[PDB]
Design an enzyme around this catalytic site. Structure first.
Site, short mmCIF file in Angstrom:
data_model
loop_
_atom_site.label_atom_id
_atom_site.label_comp_id
_atom_site.label_asym_id
_atom_site.label_seq_id
_atom_site.Cartn_x
_atom_site.Cartn_y
_atom_site.Cartn_z
N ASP A 32 27.60 -6.95 55.01
CA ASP A 32 27.34 -5.64 54.39
C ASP A 32 28.66 -4.88 54.14
OD1 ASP A 32 26.00 -3.00 53.85
OD2 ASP A 32 24.19 -4.08 54.48
N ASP A 41 25.71 5.74 68.92
CA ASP A 41 24.40 5.05 69.03
C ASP A 41 24.48 3.60 68.57
OD1 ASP A 41 21.86 5.42 70.07
OD2 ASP A 41 20.94 5.77 68.14
N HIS A 64 26.17 2.37 54.00
CA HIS A 64 24.99 1.50 53.92
C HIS A 64 24.97 0.51 55.10
CE1 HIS A 64 22.89 -2.14 52.32
NE2 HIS A 64 22.08 -1.29 51.72
N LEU A 75 21.28 1.75 69.79
CA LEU A 75 21.18 1.58 71.25
C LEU A 75 19.99 2.31 71.86
CD1 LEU A 75 24.93 2.06 72.08
CD2 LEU A 75 23.67 -0.15 72.10
N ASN A 77 18.94 4.61 74.56
CA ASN A 77 19.62 5.63 75.37
C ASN A 77 18.93 6.96 75.15
OD1 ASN A 77 20.51 6.32 72.83
ND2 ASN A 77 22.59 5.45 73.08
N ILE A 79 19.94 9.35 72.98
CA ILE A 79 20.39 9.96 71.71
C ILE A 79 19.86 9.26 70.47
CG2 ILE A 79 22.51 10.90 72.73
CD1 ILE A 79 24.06 8.63 71.07
N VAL A 81 18.55 7.38 67.31
CA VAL A 81 17.37 6.54 67.06
C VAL A 81 17.37 5.35 68.00
CG1 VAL A 81 17.08 7.31 64.63
CG2 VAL A 81 18.68 5.37 65.14
N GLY A 169 17.95 -13.58 48.27
CA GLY A 169 16.56 -13.56 48.68
C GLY A 169 15.74 -14.65 48.01
N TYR A 171 16.32 -17.66 47.08
CA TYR A 171 16.47 -19.06 47.55
C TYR A 171 15.43 -19.39 48.62
CZ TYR A 171 20.95 -19.07 45.10
OH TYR A 171 21.97 -18.97 44.16
N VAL A 174 16.11 -18.70 52.43
CA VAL A 174 16.31 -17.30 52.87
C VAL A 174 14.96 -16.59 52.94
CG1 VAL A 174 17.43 -15.07 52.18
CG2 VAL A 174 18.65 -17.21 51.79
N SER A 221 16.77 -2.87 51.26
CA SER A 221 17.87 -2.89 52.26
C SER A 221 17.42 -2.41 53.65
CB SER A 221 18.99 -1.95 51.87
OG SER A 221 19.87 -2.60 50.95
CA LIG Z 1 19.53 5.67 70.77
NA NA Z 2 13.57 -16.91 49.84
#
Ligand SMILES: [Ca+2]
Ligand code: NA
Lengths: 281, 63
Positions: A32, A41, A64, A75, A77, A79, A81, A169, A171, A174, A221
């Site tokens: 990416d 986080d 992104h 993570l 924890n 905080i 997400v 995607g 193929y 994948v 994505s």
């Molecule tokens: Ca978290």
């Molecule tokens: Na595929």
């Protein structure tokens, strides 16, 4: 306090967490735009950059890759997400620049780095309308080597009866992932075609953004890393399962939605996938 | 209006002008055709994929 984005609950990741499985010791490459390693986080275990003018994979000048990474592995924890696989070993494989684009050779170099560094899972929240033999060989090589390879289906919407799934995607090797919302409805932008494999949440997905921020993004994505994180949860519970087996476990246990041209096999369900015996709910 | 098939084969300059008439707040980014890109969906964005002559090579669409 930490919040659990709806998409993490929707694919039933908390059922794996409560069994004690969070993706520990599973290596996931986010191929990416980089990952902001300074985010409190996220924990980034390593990586590499294939972008000639942006040599630091731990600097994400787009945002992104950092958002995608948080859906895989934010993570656990007090905080921000929670990620799908919050204990996964997260690798920043930078193949896209600040403008969100990369040359085919940069993507291939990142896939090759992932194979050489024994990644268990690759996530590619990226695509283009054309393939190449070299691209196909890189993904097929990763899969032949044991790697679970997941990619966004594309955001091309419909075009009559034509497939609009992009590459990599498209193929067979994948897993191509389309996007649904919190009511399991296909997002209007989500690509379609017989190459669509499974769906995951891809509308208004909260995740990590660079400079210690959070925000809601939309896209196939955002759907792809739910599936890449689900593969890491499955491997943490069944460390000897092959990529073949992790892929079939996800495909064989979806909640079926509409016609497969628009929904593939349906919404993934990682609780059902991680059982020994598989069926659709 | 979310796609511009009539712009394929035109200059990148005319394509920008036309898209901004239809969608004045568009965030236009010009990229080389045959690159791979991020798959987030941005309602305000129009990517223009150009060939090496700077002509539009693929149908511009919002996203
Ligand atoms: Ca978290
Ligand atoms: Na595929």
């Amino acid at each position: 306090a930490q919040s659990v984005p709806y998409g993490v609950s929707q694919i039933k990741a908390p059922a794996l967490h409560s069994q004690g499985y969070t993706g520990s010791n599973v290596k996931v490459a986010v191929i990416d735009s980089g990952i902001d390693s300074s985010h409190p986080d996220l924990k980034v275990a390593g990586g590499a950059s294939m972008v000639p003018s942006e040599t630091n994979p731990f600097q994400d000048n787009n945002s992104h890759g950092t958002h995608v990474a948080g859906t895989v592995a934010a993570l656990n924890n007090s905080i921000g997400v929670l990620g799908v696989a919050p204990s996964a070993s997260l690798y920043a494989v930078k193949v896209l620049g600040a403008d969100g684009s990369g040359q085919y050779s940069w993507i291939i170099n990142g896939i090759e780095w992932a194979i050489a560094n024994n990644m268990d899972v690759i996530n590619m929240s990226l695509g283009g309308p054309s393939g190449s033999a070299a691209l196909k060989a890189a993904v097929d090589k990763a899969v032949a080597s044991g790697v679970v390879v997941v990619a966004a289906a594309g955001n091309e919407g419909t075009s009559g009866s034509s497939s609009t799934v992009g590459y990599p995607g498209k193929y067979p090797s994948v897993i191509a992932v389309g996007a649904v919302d919190s009511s399991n409805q296909r997002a209007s932008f989500s690509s379609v075609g017989p190459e669509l494999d499974v769906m995951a949440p891809g509308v208004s997905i909260q995740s990590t953004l660079p400079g210690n921020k959070y925000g809601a993004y939309n896209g196939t994505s955002m759907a792809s890393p739910h599936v890449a994180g689900a593969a890491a949860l499955i491997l943490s519970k069944h460390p000897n399962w092959t990529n073949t087996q992790v892929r079939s476990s996800l495909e064989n246990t979806t909640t079926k939605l509409g016609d497969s041209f628009y929904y593939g096999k349906g919404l993934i369900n990682v609780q059902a996938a991680a059982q020994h015996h598989h069926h659709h709910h | 209006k979310t796609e511009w098939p009539e712009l394929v084969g035109k200059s990148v300059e005319e394509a920008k002008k036309v898209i901004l008439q239809d969608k004045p707040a568009a965030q236009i980014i010009v990229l080389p055709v045959g690159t791979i890109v991020t798959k987030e969906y941005r309602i305000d964005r129009v990517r223009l994929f150009v060939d090496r002559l700077d002509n539009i090579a693929q149908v511009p669409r919002v996203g």
